[PDB]
C-alpha cells in the first residue's frame, strides 16, 4: 500500500487497482497548462520524480500523469508566504492528471502522486484509482540549519531541502553565522569571511549562496537568511574592528568582547551597507534579525557605554538600550523594503515594532501565552518552541512533536489567524554532516505533518505505520533518515 | 600536534621534529622478527596504515617503521582474552621501530605510531622522537551491536570493526538474533533464518559469517556471539515448532507465546545440537548465553509447565525453573568445551553457576554493589551499565561515561581481579545503518580510553583536546564521528 506523508487534506480512495510501466510512463505537460516546455522547476521535477517512483491487465496501465497549471505559473519567481501550494490529484487510467493554480502545488502534488504508488510481490509498480485535493494548514513551514557552530558543506545543504521537498516544507531558516565563525563571504566587507570564518575552505561563496538559493527554488522552497545581531556575534569581531563591545571589570579593560556595540555610528553605518548587501543576495521578503540571548554583563560594565546610558536616561535598564538598538536595525530593514522576523526575546524585552513584524517564539517556558500576547499586539507569529530538534532524547520523541497542536493557546478567532506557522530547529553545536540528516528526519516530519495536514489528524498509530513507510522511501531516494523503532525497509 | 587516544601507559615525547616523505616512507618487517613476510595480517595491517597516514631538513627523515614481533607470532591465530597486546615504539631517525611480543600489540602499535603523525601548514608530514612502552589495563574491551532489532549489512559491521581497531577495542559482542528477528542462518536448522528474519535479504549466511570473524581477526578482535535464551526468543519460534511457552489465559489458550518452553525435553536437544553448530562456527572460546530479561506471566499461565512446577516442588518461584533452564544451557556448553557469559539476571536469581562463567553486569541501579557481589562468589565480572550507548541524552555525555572508575566498588585487592573489563552497548529498536556509526563513535571513545589506559588518567580539559582531534581523525578515515561539540576539522 501506499504511505502519504503528510496526509493531504482529501483522500479518497477507491479499490480499483492501476499499474505503472517502467518502460513507457512518463510525466509531462497537459497542452492545456500555463507553463510550458519552457518551465525548468517542472521539467526538472518531472525528470527526478520519474527516477523516485522507479529507478486482468485490460484497461489497468497508467500511462501518462499530466500536469496541468491553471494561472500564472510563477515558473519563473521565487516562492512566497502567499504562494499557493494547492493541488488536486485525478488518478485514473489511462491518463492521470495533476492540476494546480501554481508551479508551486505541482511540485507538491508530484511528490503525493509519487507516494501513491506501491510495488507488490512480483516489482509491479501499482497505484489505486483516487482522487485528492489538497493544500496546507498554514504557509510558514521552516526548517532551521546552523552553520556556524559548524560548517556545512553546501552537499548537505542541497540533500537537506531534497529531504524538505519529501516532506512538503517550504523555508529553509538558515542560521548562517553566529559566536563560533562566520562562514557568510560578504562582497562589501571580505573581512568578516577572511578573519571569522573556521578557515578558508569552511566558507560559502556567492556562488554557493546562488545555488542553495535556486536549487531551493526549484523546490519550491524560500531561503531566509538570519544575521543574528547583537548577540551571538563573536565571529563578526575579528573582522570588522570596533563592532564589539569591549568587555571591562571596574576599569580594568579585559581582552574579552560581548554584544555589538550599540552606542557607536560607525556600527550602524556597518549594518547599513551590510543589509544593504543581503537584501540583494537573498531574494525573499524577509530578514531574520535575531536578538536572542543578549548578555548584558559586557554592555553594563563598559565606561563608554555606561556615559550613553546617563546620557538617554535608561539608567540600569539594559532592555532599553537592547530595544534602541534593534529598532535602529529594524529601520534600516524596512528601508531597503525589506521584512523582518524577530527571535520573541525583541517583542519580550519590550521594543517598539513596525506592524507587519514577524515573531518567533523559541522559548518552552509556557509559549502558549507567549503567542497569546504576541498575537494580542497585532504581530504574526511563528512557533519553534517545542520542536527544538538540537535536544535529543531517548526513544520516540517523534510523538512528542506530532503530538502539539499549536492554535491551543488563549485568543480570537483574529488573533489565531496571525499565526502563520512554525519551524522545526537544529542547532549546529552537537550537529554536522556527519549526523545531520539521520538527527533531523525523521523527526522533523512530525513537524511537517502538523504544519501541512488538518488540525485533526491525530491518530497515532496511523501516523506510526504511515511515518515508518514514509522514512523507508526518504531512506530508498538517498537520505539517511533513522528508524523510528525496531524493524525493516524493503 | 598528536592526538592519542587511548593514552597509552608511558609516553616520552622529546622536541626533536622528524619528517615522513609520502613518496618514500614504508612499514615491512624488522628482519630479527618472528612474523615472516607470510604474515598476512601484519602485510594487510602495514599497507591499510600507510594509507591512514598519507593518502634544517638533515637527519631528520625517518624512511622506515621496521615492525618486530618478539615471541611466536600467534600470526595464524584468534585472539583471546589472554591475547598479549603489550608494544613498545620507538619512534627515531632513520628507523622508527616498533616491537611487540605478539602480532596483537603491533596492531595496537600501529594504530598508536599513526596517530603519532601530524601535518604542519605546507602539509609536511611531521612526528616528533619519542618513546612509548603501552598496554592494557583491561583486556575484555567490548561493543555490543544487536542485528536482530535492525539488521546491520555485512559492511557496516566491517565498517565498526575499522572504528573498533581505531580505539583499540577487541571484542565484538554480536547480539546477533533476539525477538524481532533471527538473521543468523544455520546449516542444521534452515527454518529459523527462513521463517524468523525480517526477509530473504536480512540474513547472515556462513560466508558472511566467515567474513565477519576474519576481518575482526585481522584486525585483533575477537567476535563473541549472543544467542540470548530464554525470553527474547520470539523470533525464535517461527522456525521451531513446540520451542516456545504457549500463553493462557485462566484454561483459554492464547495465540500468543512467551520464552522458551524449559520444561520439554526437545527443547534441549535442540538447544544441544544448535549450540554445537555455534562452537564449531564461532571459534572464539565464550558463547554468550544471555539469560536477561525473562517474562514469567506466560510460563506461570501455562497449564504443562504449572504440572511441571509441584512436579519439582518450584511452589510459585519462576526463579529456580528458570534456574534449571539455564543450568541445562551452561552444561551443555561445557561440554562441547566452551566457556560461558550470562548477563547478570542469571547470576541475580540464584541460578547455580560452574566457576570460570563470566558474568556481565548491565543493571544500572547501584552496580557498583553488583560488583561486589559477583566477585564476592568466585566469578569473573564484565561491566556494561553505565555504556548503555541506545540511552542518547542532549549534550556532551562522553564525559558521564568517561568519568566512570569502574573498580570503585567494594572487595578486596584479589575480587577486585576478577573484573576483566567493559563493553559500551548499542541496542538496536533505535539504531540501523543510517545512524549507527554517528550514535556509536566518538562516544564509545570514552569507554575505550577507560578500559585501555590508567585509572589516573582523568584529566577533562585534556581528553576533550584528544578525542576532539581523534574524532577528526576518525572521519578522515571514514567513520563518520559526531562532533563533541562546536567547531571544525582540518
Ligand atoms: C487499493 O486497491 C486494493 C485492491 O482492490 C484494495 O485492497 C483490497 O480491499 C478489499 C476490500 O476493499 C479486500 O477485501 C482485499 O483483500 C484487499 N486487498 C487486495 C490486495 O486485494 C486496497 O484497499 C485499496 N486501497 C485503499 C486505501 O482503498
Ligand atoms: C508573492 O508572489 C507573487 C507572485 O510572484 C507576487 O505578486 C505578483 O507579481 C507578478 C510579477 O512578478 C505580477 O505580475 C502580479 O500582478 C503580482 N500579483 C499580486 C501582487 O497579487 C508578490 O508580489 C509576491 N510578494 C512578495 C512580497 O514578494
Ligand atoms: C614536538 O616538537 C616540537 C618542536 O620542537 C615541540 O614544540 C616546541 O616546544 C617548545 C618548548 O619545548 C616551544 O618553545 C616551541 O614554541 C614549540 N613549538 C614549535 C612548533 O616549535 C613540541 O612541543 C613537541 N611535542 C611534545 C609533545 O613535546
Ligand atoms: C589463547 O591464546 C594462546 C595462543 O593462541 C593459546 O595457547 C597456545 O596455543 C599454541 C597452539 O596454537 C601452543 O603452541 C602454545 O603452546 C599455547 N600456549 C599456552 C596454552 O600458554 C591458548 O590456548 C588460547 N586460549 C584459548 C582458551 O583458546
Known amino acids: 500500500g501506499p504511505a502519504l506523508w503528510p496526509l493531504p487534506l482529501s483522500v479518497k480512495m477507491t479499490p480499483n487497482l492501476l499499474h505503472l510501466a517502467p518502460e513507457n510512463f512518463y510525466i509531462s505537460h497537459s497542452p492545456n497548462s500555463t507553463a510550458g516546455p519552457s518551465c525548468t522547476l517542472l521539467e526538472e521535477a518531472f525528470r527526478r520524480y520519474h527516477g523516485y517512483i522507479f529507478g486482468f491487465q485490460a484497461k489497468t496501465q497508467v500511462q501518462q500523469l ?13 516562492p512566497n508566504i502567499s504562494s499557493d501550494e494547492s493541488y488536486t490529484l485525478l488518478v485514473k487510467e489511462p491518463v492521470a492528471v495533476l492540476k494546480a493554480n501554481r508551479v508551486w502545488g505541482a511540485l507538491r502534488g508530484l511528490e503525493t502522486f509519487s507516494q501513491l504508488v506501491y510495488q507488490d510481490s512480483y516489482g509491479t509498480f501499482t497505484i489505486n484509482e483516487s482522487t485528492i485535493i489538497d493544500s496546507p494548514r498554514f504557509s510558514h513551514r521552516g526548517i532551521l540549519i546552523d552553520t556556524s557552530r559548524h560548517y556545512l558543506p553546501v552537499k548537505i545543504i542541497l540533500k537537506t531541502l531534497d529531504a524538505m521537498a519529501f516532506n512538503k516544507f517550504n523555508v529553509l531558516h538558515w542560521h548562517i553565522v553566529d559566536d563560533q565563525s562566520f562562514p557568510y563571504q560578504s562582497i562589501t566587507f571580505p573581512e568578516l569571511s577572511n578573519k571569522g570564518s573556521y578557515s578558508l575552505s569552511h566558507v560559502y561563496t556567492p556562488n554557493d549562496v546562488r545555488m542553495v538559493i535556486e536549487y531551493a527554488r526549484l523546490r519550491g522552497i524560500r531561503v531566509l537568511p538570519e544575521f543574528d545581531t547583537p548577540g551571538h556575534t563573536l565571529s563578526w569581531g575579528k573582522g570588522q574592528k570596533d563592532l564589539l563591545t569591549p568587555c571591562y571589570s571596574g576599569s580594568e579593560p579585559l581582552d574579552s568582547f560581548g554584544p555589538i556595540n550599540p552606542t557607536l555610528n560607525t556600527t550602524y553605518s556597518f549594518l547599513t551597507t551590510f543589509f544593504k548587501e543581503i537584501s540583494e543576495v537573498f531574494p525573499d521578503q524577509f530578514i531574520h534579525l535575531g536578538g536572542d540571548e543578549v548578555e548584558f554583563k559586557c554592555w553594563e560594565s563598559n565606561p563608554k557605554i555606561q556615559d550613553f546610558m546617563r546620557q538617554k536616561g535608561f539608567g540600569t535598564d539594559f532592555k532599553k538600550l537592547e530595544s534602541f538598538y534593534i529598532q535602529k536595525v529594524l529601520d534600516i530593514i524596512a ?19 513596525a506592524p507587519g513584524t514577524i515573531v518567533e517564539v523559541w522559548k518552552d517556558s509556557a509559549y502558549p501565552e507567549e503567542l497569546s500576547r504576541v498575537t494580542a499586539s497585532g504581530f504574526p507569529v511563528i512557533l519553534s518552541a517545542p520542536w527544538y530538534l538540537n535536544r535529543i532524547s531517548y526513544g520516540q520523541d517523534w510523538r512528542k512533536y506530532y503530538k502539539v497542536e499549536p492554535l491551543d493557546f488563549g485568543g480570537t478567532q483574529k488573533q489565531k489567524q496571525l499565526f502563520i506557522g512554525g519551524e522545526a530547529c537544529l542547532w549546529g553545536e552537537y550537529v554536522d554532516a556527519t549526523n545531520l540528516t539521520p538527527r533531523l528526519w525523521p523527526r522533523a516530519s512530525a513537524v511537517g505533518e502538523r504544519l501541512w495536514s488538518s488540525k485533526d489528524v491525530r491518530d497515532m498509530d496511523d501516523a506510526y505505520d504511515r511515518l515508518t513507510r514514509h522514512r523507508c522511501r526518504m531512506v530508498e531516494r538517498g537520505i539517511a533518515a533513522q528508524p523510528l523503532y525496531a524493524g525493516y525497509c524493503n
Open 335 to 353: 528601508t531597503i523594503n525589506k521584512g523582518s522576523i524577530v527571535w520573541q526575546e525583541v517583542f519580550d524585552d519590550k521594543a517598539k515594532l
Open 66 to 78: 499530466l500536469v496541468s497549471i491553471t494561472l500564472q505559473s510563477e515558473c519563473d519567481a521565487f
